[PDB]
Design an enzyme around this catalytic site. Structure first.
Site, PDB file in Angstrom:
ATOM      1  CE  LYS B 117      36.310  16.536  18.605  1.00 20.69           C
ATOM      2  NZ  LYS B 117      37.165  17.259  19.586  1.00 20.69           N
ATOM      3  CG  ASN B 236      47.224  11.716  23.346  1.00 18.44           C
ATOM      4  OD1 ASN B 236      48.095  12.261  22.659  1.00 18.44           O
ATOM      5  ND2 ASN B 236      46.524  10.696  22.921  1.00 18.44           N
ATOM      6  CD  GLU B 276      42.421  22.097  24.711  1.00 20.33           C
ATOM      7  OE1 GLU B 276      42.888  21.431  23.763  1.00 20.33           O
ATOM      8  OE2 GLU B 276      41.982  21.575  25.757  1.00 20.33           O
ATOM      9  CD  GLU B 289      38.106  20.079  23.482  1.00 22.35           C
ATOM     10  OE1 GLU B 289      39.262  20.260  23.918  1.00 22.35           O
ATOM     11  OE2 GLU B 289      37.417  19.079  23.774  1.00 22.35           O
ATOM     12  CG  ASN B 291      38.658  21.718  27.253  1.00 17.76           C
ATOM     13  OD1 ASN B 291      38.051  20.703  26.919  1.00 17.76           O
ATOM     14  ND2 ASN B 291      39.953  21.890  27.023  1.00 17.76           N
ATOM     15  CG  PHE B 349      58.260   8.436  27.344  1.00 18.89           C
ATOM     16  CD1 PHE B 349      59.336   9.262  27.633  1.00 18.89           C
ATOM     17  CD2 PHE B 349      58.271   7.725  26.154  1.00 18.89           C
ATOM     18  CE1 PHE B 349      60.395   9.379  26.754  1.00 18.89           C
ATOM     19  CE2 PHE B 349      59.331   7.837  25.273  1.00 18.89           C
ATOM     20  CZ  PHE B 349      60.393   8.665  25.572  1.00 18.89           C
TER      21      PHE B 349
END
Ligand SMILES: CC(=O)SCCNC(=O)CCNC(=O)[C@H](O)C(C)(C)COP(=O)(O)OP(=O)(O)OC[C@H]1O[C@@H](n2cnc3c(N)ncnc32)[C@H](O)[C@@H]1OP(=O)(O)O
Lengths: 180, 668
Positions: B117, B236, B276, B289, B291, B349
């Site tokens: 990060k 997620n 993103e 972020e 990718n 779910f």
């Protein structure tokens, strides 16, 4: 005498809808298929009262001649159904498979399932490893018209599968092994 | 021109995508597979294949040494790993490059550059994107909590300097509850983990997750493509995406596209990847972020940009510049994508199911529908891999056309043999908030606060379902009477003018009377008149009916002689018990005996020695999951669970000998 004379001439179906004792218990042995109703029908010659009086053994009505015993262990009853209404609904469906007499060919009925379709699902059912079992019923259901199969004695002698189905409208009998 | 032979280091639909593109390009494609994937689709589509290892991926798709042997064995020139397995594995790329094999994907600099990060945030500051400041210090006083917020912004979050899970976290907007939130956390947090140092940073409300894709060039160029809205998700993981968002106008798209390029051109990301962003309710966009890998959400942008991402990645890897300029990238219509998993949507779910596929038919006859699947009938889905079935892509000229076409594709999409999530996809896309666009990244959690329950029928829909089920019931009853005539025993068709049925749904019993007028059944459902017209081909998996002018597609999944039918209507399977008037009137005399469901008690079906147990207490168990293997008579009899849950006790261990009926494992 009539039940023996009719053998191989007309189908004989016997559905047991309650208790049966004495000589009456032998007629399903002469007919072609015997069906029962779970927890309602019985098949025995003598009742538990005689077993207790003759020999020092303790047994109840269901254990001696209940539907579960004859469909799972003795091999006498071809199938038991949950209740009276379901038993007769399945009996109508079973009836539609059989000819009226042995002088008639296997019935042929209207069928919408194309006779020339392929079943790609079969190519990978059988493992290459010899010690891996598979469910033979998956093959039977995929071949027969519209995937309808009528299984006989589902809970007795599970290593061999027998039952009725149709292919291109015509009634056929299916026999096969169950590797599981 | 291009490569002669490319090896793919992946499995499933992503491998199929590359194989199809290579064949279009005239390039031979090599596949790799595990022993269980030897009959999978991508293996058969490829030109050559090498078996690498056994079922578990760690030894078959993550075994870079065995893969390197396959790469040289087939004299492959380039490798395309797709995504997932070794797409970010630096040791693989390092030892692959050491052997002069062209790697298609990021180089190792880009992988490390975004490794953590700190470098990502530093890039966003240099590329100048956003990354909103916080307070670089500890807030100690009661007035600092508000004074610092006043200098930076308005929505302010109070959190612990280190920790998480609600470690003194509160959301504040004005100064009164910012002061109150700090002093509460600074006096009580010391009682939890011994730390009462608070930091403040800035947050956003009802976020939307928006992606922008960038195509890098080895020559220094980079273009940005249309965005993707990816807010519908569970655990997620995304399930539904839309390309032409809705939260962007022409200027916002350019503004954010340029920032996504600014990131790519400052690390020299000469590969394809995704950036993103999060956007708040006020259209303020914040960096989240960067990718580096072909995303699983790359088949929905292609339908509105008109590009082929795999074809482009291969040419860039060969060394060609980008074939397009930014002025030629536009939105040609709308495209929406739904991911179909072999999962039970009711069990929190998406709980994975285990099984084999017995019927499978993709809706490829419908307009605007593209199905990208890695499976074929007679494929197994197992615990070793993410249970993906397919990705269903629908496009159209407008937002309503693409959504309507998607609804149609889902109802004409036949999956049988496993539990799937079509019911969930079919209801979300028709939700009033989804059609309008009021979707946040927590959409599903507020719509289904008590779990997924299935499609809910309204009055008119119940009448249509009852009329369809009743007419189909009679259609089978009439077909049953049509025999070839036996000249010895005449058959007389009963003259049944009216079928009087008692149709039980969930907890209601409806009165239905039907009559046949040829191809159309006139059905009265509790006084309502419906006319169901069809061809009534009873063998097809897809039955098309028209009910009072309304076009429906239904599937009949099972039928019993006792009147039970399983019918899928609008994606949801409904259980209906259809009895004749007489059967229903007499059935009331039956005793309502109830037996016990003992699906948690797993017993040996066959005597022999236990050779494997897949579990210990606490292990998760799916329906159809293998639990124990018992071997005798030169055969291994696999015992599976009939209940989802966790294991409570394992009663027999490997090496033990068991008989018929002995208890092996007990579930919770
Ligand atoms: C050795 C051989 O193979 S020959 C066997 C000879 N068989 C018999 O005579 C019957 C065997 N024993 C019985 O009678 C038993 O009671 C069975 C087999 C009928 C089973 O009994 P259940 O199913 O409980 O019926 P149950 O006997 O309680 O029925 C009672 C009624 O049925 C009638 N009934 C019962 N058994 C008989 C019988 N054996 N003969 C004639 N009528 C009988 C009675 O009239 C009685 O009248 P109620 O309505 O006032 O009660």
């Amino acid at each position: 005498l009539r039940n023996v004379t009719a053998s191989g001439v007309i189908p004989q179906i016997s559905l047991i809808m309650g208790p049966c004792a004495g000589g009456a218990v032998y007629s399903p042995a002469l007919t072609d298929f015997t069906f029962m109703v779970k927890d309602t029908s019985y098949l025995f010659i003598t009742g538990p009262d005689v077993v207790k009086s003759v020999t020092n053994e303790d047994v109840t009505q269901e254990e001696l001649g209940g539907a579960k015993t004859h469909t799972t262990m003795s091999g006498v009853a071809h199938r038991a159904f949950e209740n009276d209404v379901d038993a007769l609904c399945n009996l109508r469906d079973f009836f539609n498979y059989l000819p009226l007499s042995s002088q008639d060919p296997a019935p042929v009925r209207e069928c919408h399932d194309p006779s020339d379709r392929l079943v790609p699902e079969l190519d990978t059912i059988v493992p290459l490893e010899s010690t891996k079992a598979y469910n033979m019923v998956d093959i039977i259901h995929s071949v027969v018209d519209e995937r309808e199969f009528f299984e006989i004695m589902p809970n007795y002698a599970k290593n061999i599968i027998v039952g009725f189905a149709r292919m291109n409208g015509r009634t056929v009998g299916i026999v096969g092994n169950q590797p599981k | 021109k291009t490569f002669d032979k490319i090896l793919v280091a992946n499995r499933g639909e992503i491998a199929c995508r590359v194989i199809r593109t290579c064949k279009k390009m005239g390039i031979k494609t090599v596949a790799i597979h595990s022993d269980v994937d030897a009959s999978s689709v991508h293996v058969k589509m490829a030109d050559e294949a090498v078996c690498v290892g056994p079922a578990p991926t760690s030894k078959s798709y993550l075994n870079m040494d065995a893969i390197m042997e396959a790469i040289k064995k087939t004299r492959a020139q380039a490798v395309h790993p797709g995504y997932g397995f070794l797409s970010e594995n630096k040791e693989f790329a390092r030892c692959l490059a050491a052997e002069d094999v062209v790697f298609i994907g990021p180089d190792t600099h880009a992988i490390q550059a975004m490794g953590d990060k700190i470098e990502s945030k530093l890039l966003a500051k240099k590329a100048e994107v956003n990354t909103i400041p916080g307070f670089d210090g500890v807030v100690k006083d009661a007035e600092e909590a508000v004074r610092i917020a006043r200098e930076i912004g308005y929505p302010v979050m109070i959190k612990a300097s280190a920790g998480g899970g609600g470690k003194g976290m509160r959301i504040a907007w004005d100064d009164e509850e910012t002061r109150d939130g700090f002093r509460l956390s600074s006096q009580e947090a010391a009682s939890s983990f011994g730390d009462d140092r608070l930091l403040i940073e800035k947050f956003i409300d009802n976020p939307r997750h928006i992606e922008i894709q960038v195509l890098g060039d080895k020559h220094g160029n980079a273009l940005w493509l249309n965005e993707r809205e990816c807010s519908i998700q569970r655990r997620n993981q995304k399930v539904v995406e839309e390309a032409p968002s809705i939260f962007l106008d022409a200027e916002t798209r350019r503004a954010m596209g340029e920032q996504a390029v600014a990131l790519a051109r400052a690390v020299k990301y000469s590969s394809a990847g995704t950036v993103e962003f999060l956007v708040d309710s006020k259209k303020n966009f914040y960096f989240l972020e960067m990718n580096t890998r072909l995303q699983v959400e790359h088949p929905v942008t292609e339908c509105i940009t008109g590009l082929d991402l795999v074809q482009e990645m291969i040419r860039v890897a060969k060394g060609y510049p980008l074939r397009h300029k930014q002025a030629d990238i536009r939105i040609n219509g709308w495209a929406v994508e739904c991911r179909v998993y072999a999962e039970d949507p009711y069990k929190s779910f998406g709980l994975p199911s285990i099984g084999r596929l017995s019927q499978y038919q993709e809706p490829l006859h419908l307009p605007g529908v593209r199905v990208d699947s890695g499976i074929q009938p007679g494929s197994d889905i197992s615990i070793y891999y993410d249970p993906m079935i397919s990705k269903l892509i629908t496009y159209g000229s407008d937002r309503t056309e693409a959504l309507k076409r998607m609804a149609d594709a889902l109802d004409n999409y036949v999956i049988r043999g496993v539990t799937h999530n079509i019911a969930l996809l079919r209801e979300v896309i028709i939700n009033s908030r989804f059609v309008k666009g009021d979707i946040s990244t927590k959409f599903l959690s507020d719509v289904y606060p008590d779990g997924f329950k299935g499609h809910m029928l309204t009055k008119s829909e119940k009448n249509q379902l009852l009329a369809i089920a009743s007419s189909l019931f009679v259609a089978f009853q009439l077909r049953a009477q049509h025999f070839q005539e036996n000249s010895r025993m005449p058959v007389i068709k009963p003259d049944i003018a009216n079928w009087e049925l008692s149709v039980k749904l969930h907890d209601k019993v409806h009165t239905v009377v039907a009559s046949n007028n040829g191809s159309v059944f006139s059905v009265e459902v509790d006084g309502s008149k419906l006319n169901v017209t069809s061809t009534w081909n009873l063998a097809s998996p897809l039955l098309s009916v028209s009910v009072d002018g309304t076009q429906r597609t239904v599937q009949c999944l099972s039928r019993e002689a006792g009147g039970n039918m399983s019918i899928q209507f609008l994606g949801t399977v409904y259980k209906v018990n259809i009895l004749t008037r007489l059967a229903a009137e007499l059935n009331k005399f039956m005793l309502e005996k109830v037996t016990e469901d003992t699906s948690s008690v797993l017993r040996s079906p066959m005597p022999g020695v236990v050779v494997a147990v897949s579990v210990k207490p606490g292990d998760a168990v799916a329906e159809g999951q293998e639990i124990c293997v018992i071997e005798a008579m030169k055969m291994q009899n696999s015992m599976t669970a009939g209940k989802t849950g966790t294991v409570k006790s394992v009663h027999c261990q490997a090496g033990d000998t068991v008989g018929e009926g002995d208890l092996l494992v007990e579930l919770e």
